[PDB]
UniProtKB/Swiss-Prot annotation, chain A:
Keywords for this protein: Activator, DNA-binding, Isopeptide bond, Metal-binding, Nucleus, Receptor, Transcription, Transcription regulation, Ubl conjugation, Zinc, Zinc-finger
Annotated ranges, domain NR LBD: 4-239
Superkingdom of source: Eukaryota
Protein name listed in UniProt: Oxysterols receptor LXR-beta
Cross-link for Glycyl lysine isopeptide (Lys-Gly) (interchain with G-Cter in SUMO2), residue positions: K191, K229
Region feature (Transactivation AF-2): 1-239
GO BP annotations, alphabetical order: cell differentiation; cholesterol homeostasis; hormone-mediated signaling pathway; intracellular receptor signaling pathway; mRNA transcription by RNA polymerase II; negative regulation of cholesterol storage; negative regulation of cold-induced thermogenesis; negative regulation of DNA-templated transcription
Name of the encoding gene: NR1H2
Residues of the full protein shown: 219 to 457 of 460
Protein's organism: Homo sapiens (Human)
SUBUNIT field: Forms a heterodimer with RXR. Interacts with CCAR2 (via N-terminus) in a ligand-independent manner. Interacts (when sumoylated) with GPS2; interaction with GPS2 onto hepatic acute phase protein promoters prevents N-Cor corepressor complex dissociation. Interacts with ABCA12 and ABCA1; this interaction is required for ABCA1 localization to the cell surface and is necessary for its normal activity and stability.
PTM (free text): Sumoylated by SUMO2 at Lys-191 and Lys-229 during the hepatic acute phase response, leading to promote interaction with GPS2 and prevent N-Cor corepressor complex dissociation.
Function: Nuclear receptor that exhibits a ligand-dependent transcriptional activation activity. Binds preferentially to double-stranded oligonucleotide direct repeats having the consensus half-site sequence 5'-AGGTCA-3' and 4-nt spacing (DR-4). Regulates cholesterol uptake through MYLIP-dependent ubiquitination of LDLR, VLDLR and LRP8; DLDLR and LRP8. Interplays functionally with RORA for the regulation of genes involved in liver metabolism. Induces LPCAT3-dependent phospholipid remodeling in endoplasmic reticulum (ER) membranes of hepatocytes, driving SREBF1 processing and lipogenesis.
GO molecular function: apolipoprotein A-I receptor binding; ATPase binding; chromatin DNA binding; DNA binding; DNA-binding transcription activator activity, RNA polymerase II-specific; DNA-binding transcription factor activity, RNA polymerase II-specific; nuclear receptor activity; nuclear retinoid X receptor binding
Length: 249, 225
């Protein structure tokens, strides 16, 4: 790997790293998880759902703030910036969700120490048909055994997709992606020269994430139909004045 | 370098593909679409390892893959000098001639976008045949009976394609990633096609039971014969 890449990966891992620290700043701020309440309680399930949406908000903010730190993103037009973000934010979140999965306990730890099992997502009114794919995806990512550099590069590759809808300049975004693919290819050859198929398997997770983006759109439509109210930011992304405000700041 | 077993398997796949190879024009396209599905399932049965899986697994992988291979096969037949797509021997159609048959314009142009994108990649018969086999053996499909087996069935083709592209185009080290990114594209084009097929339904253009079944039985009979 060339020296300009080595600095870039260090820049990307640091930006990811700086974002992980920020939320913890926000952990006390969240709505509390209901304790001592009935699992079947419709009242309690709504508070559990409200808890997760606020966590989901903090994650969207992290991804937006990370996207501004990755080189070449802010050089694009704001209409393109959000167009890349709408499509990617959910996929970036499932990567981050997979990153926070523990196979020993089978629990996903959000923020500093907010741990939840497969049942806890079910008790927030989320269907198991939508929950189980996220856990299957989370197990598949642990088998690859990705590190901070490989995640961060895979995140940037995922952001710069010309394949997204409503992208005005696909050539420029594909040109912007190529260096991140170069860096990731060259980085995977130094780390595991023995395993040549390690890098292809990473790029096929981006294939998985597109189906996972689509099932999430099916879920969100069902949750709005089931009277589970999303915050304005999250509903704006998955239906963009609010989203301009983060990027402009 | 490729082994003689790997080289023989590639030429097995290329040989397998070559063996299978308004209202009036609409009936034509659906009649053409069935032939492609029949070519896909027949080709799928030529692929080594596809028939050692359970029918529940076989159908799950086909059902998801048929469009994605149809779109890959559509891209091959596109000619950029004319901007026309050539089906079978002598059936050539422009984007307007697709539009005149009642196919919606919002869905047509992404397919044409994909066809030009595939043209720029400049895939050959071998690379195409490997990419179709890689697409068939995808573990992220709905209704997985056994996802661990299909990942193992995919590996030989991904290894073959990786080693092939490094030999065929050693200068272009990123040739192999781009063609994997087209599988990422083909997933959104898959979910897009579901949205299209639905739109024709309400225009009083219901798909025939084979295409209705796949893009919602008859698929067992095609796999059986
Ligand atoms: C629909 C609402 C808005 C409630 O939720 C979401 O859109 N998602 C996306 C994925 C998500 C889901 O749908 N099922 C699920 C099962 C397990 C793990 C995550 C999820 C959920 C979620 C639920 C709880 C937490 C997160 C979350 C995802 C990523 C990150 C990492 O940045 C963080 S956090 C707060 O720790 O930053 C939180 C996501
Ligand atoms: C809705 C019905 C069921 C009628 O159509 C389809 O689902 N498809 C899938 C792809 C398709 C589409 O949706 N828009 C479109 C625009 C241009 C080119 C192909 C298409 C179309 C099609 C239309 C006409 C021909 C084909 C076709 C696609 C592939 C092959 C070869 O594999 C052959 S053929 C007959 O030459 O074997 C025909 C596909």
């Amino acid at each position: 790997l060339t020296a300009a890449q080595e600095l870039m990966i260090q820049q990307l891992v640091a930006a990811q790293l700086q974002c992980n620290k920020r939320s913890f700043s926000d952990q006390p701020k969240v709505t509390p998880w209901p304790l001592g309440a009935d699992p079947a309680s419709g009242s309690a399930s709504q508070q559990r759902f409200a808890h997760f949406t606020e966590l989901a908000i903090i994650s969207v903010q992290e991804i937006v703030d990370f996207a501004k730190q990755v080189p070449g993103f802010l050089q694009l037009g704001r209409e393109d910036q959000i167009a890349l973000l709408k499509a990617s934010t959910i996929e970036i979140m499932l990567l981050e969700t997979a990153r926070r999965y523990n196979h020993e306990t089978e629990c996903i730890t959000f923020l500093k120490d907010f741990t939840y099992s497969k049942d806890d997502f079910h008790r927030a009114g989320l269907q198991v048909e939508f929950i189980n794919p996220i856990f299957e995806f989370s197990r598949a990512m642990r088998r690859l055994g990705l590190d901070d550099a490989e995640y961060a590069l895979l995140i940037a590759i995922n952001i710069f997709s010309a394949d997204r809808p409503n992208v005005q300049e696909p050539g420029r975004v594909e040109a912007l992606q190529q260096p991140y693919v170069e860096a990731l290819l060259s980085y995977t050859r130094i780390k595991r020269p023995q395993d040549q198929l390690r890098f292809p398997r990473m790029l096929m997770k981006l294939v998985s994430l597109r189906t996972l983006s689509s099932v999430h759109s099916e879920q969100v439509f069902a949750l709005r139909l089931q009277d589970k109210k999303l915050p304005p930011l999250l509903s704006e992304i998955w239906d963009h004045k609010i989203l301009h405000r983060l990027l402009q700041d």
